[PDB]
Amino acid sequence: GSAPIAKVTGPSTGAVGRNIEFSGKDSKDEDGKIVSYDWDFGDGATSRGKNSVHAYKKAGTYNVTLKVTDDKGATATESFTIEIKNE
Fold it and tell me: Is 31 annotated as a binding residue?
Protein backbone atom coordinates (compact mmCIF):
# COMPACT_ATOMS: atom_id res chain seq x y z
CA GLY A 1 0.00 0.00 0.00
CA SER A 2 0.99 3.67 0.07
CA ALA A 3 1.52 3.71 3.86
CA PRO A 4 4.83 3.05 5.60
CA ILE A 5 4.74 0.30 8.24
CA ALA A 6 6.46 1.05 11.57
CA LYS A 7 8.35 -1.72 13.50
CA VAL A 8 10.02 -1.30 16.88
CA THR A 9 12.99 -3.53 17.83
CA GLY A 10 14.16 -3.57 21.44
CA PRO A 11 14.62 -5.77 24.51
CA SER A 12 11.55 -7.09 26.31
CA THR A 13 13.26 -6.26 29.68
CA GLY A 14 15.91 -3.88 31.04
CA ALA A 15 17.51 -2.39 34.17
CA VAL A 16 16.86 0.81 36.01
CA GLY A 17 19.35 3.46 35.07
CA ARG A 18 20.93 1.52 32.13
CA ASN A 19 20.80 2.67 28.56
CA ILE A 20 18.21 0.71 26.58
CA GLU A 21 18.65 0.63 22.82
CA PHE A 22 15.70 0.64 20.45
CA SER A 23 15.56 0.64 16.68
CA GLY A 24 13.09 1.37 13.86
CA LYS A 25 15.28 -0.29 11.22
CA ASP A 26 12.65 -3.04 10.35
CA SER A 27 10.12 -0.34 9.32
CA LYS A 28 9.43 -0.40 5.54
CA ASP A 29 7.74 1.65 2.85
CA GLU A 30 6.94 0.42 -0.66
CA ASP A 31 5.90 3.85 -1.86
CA GLY A 32 8.70 6.19 -0.61
CA LYS A 33 11.72 6.45 1.68
CA ILE A 34 11.32 6.78 5.47
CA VAL A 35 12.80 10.22 6.37
CA SER A 36 12.15 10.42 10.11
CA TYR A 37 11.68 8.35 13.23
CA ASP A 38 10.11 9.85 16.36
CA TRP A 39 10.18 8.06 19.68
CA ASP A 40 8.17 8.36 22.90
CA PHE A 41 9.58 6.16 25.70
CA GLY A 42 6.36 6.26 27.75
CA ASP A 43 7.86 8.03 30.83
CA GLY A 44 7.63 11.48 29.22
CA ALA A 45 10.91 11.35 27.38
CA THR A 46 11.15 11.55 23.58
CA SER A 47 13.91 11.18 21.02
CA ARG A 48 14.48 10.81 17.26
CA GLY A 49 16.47 8.62 14.86
CA LYS A 50 16.58 5.22 13.26
CA ASN A 51 18.19 4.08 16.55
CA SER A 52 17.42 5.57 19.95
CA VAL A 53 18.60 5.16 23.59
CA HIS A 54 16.91 5.80 26.89
CA ALA A 55 17.57 5.07 30.50
CA TYR A 56 14.53 4.73 32.73
CA LYS A 57 14.80 6.26 36.21
CA LYS A 58 12.25 4.08 37.97
CA ALA A 59 11.32 0.37 37.65
CA GLY A 60 8.01 -0.27 35.95
CA THR A 61 6.31 -1.24 32.69
CA TYR A 62 6.62 1.33 29.86
CA ASN A 63 5.01 1.65 26.45
CA VAL A 64 7.40 2.87 23.76
CA THR A 65 5.90 4.32 20.57
CA LEU A 66 7.65 4.98 17.26
CA LYS A 67 6.17 7.17 14.52
CA VAL A 68 7.81 6.94 11.11
CA THR A 69 7.25 9.57 8.41
CA ASP A 70 8.09 9.17 4.75
CA ASP A 71 9.12 11.50 1.92
CA LYS A 72 5.50 12.17 0.96
CA GLY A 73 4.46 12.97 4.58
CA ALA A 74 2.75 9.61 5.14
CA THR A 75 3.02 8.23 8.68
CA ALA A 76 2.71 5.02 10.66
CA THR A 77 3.04 4.20 14.41
CA GLU A 78 3.77 1.08 16.36
CA SER A 79 4.22 0.27 20.11
CA PHE A 80 6.59 -1.89 22.13
CA THR A 81 6.20 -2.74 25.85
CA ILE A 82 9.31 -3.08 28.00
CA GLU A 83 9.55 -4.13 31.68
CA ILE A 84 12.25 -2.28 33.59
CA LYS A 85 13.42 -3.82 36.93
CA ASN A 86 15.92 -2.95 39.62
CA GLU A 87 19.09 -5.02 39.07
Answer: yes
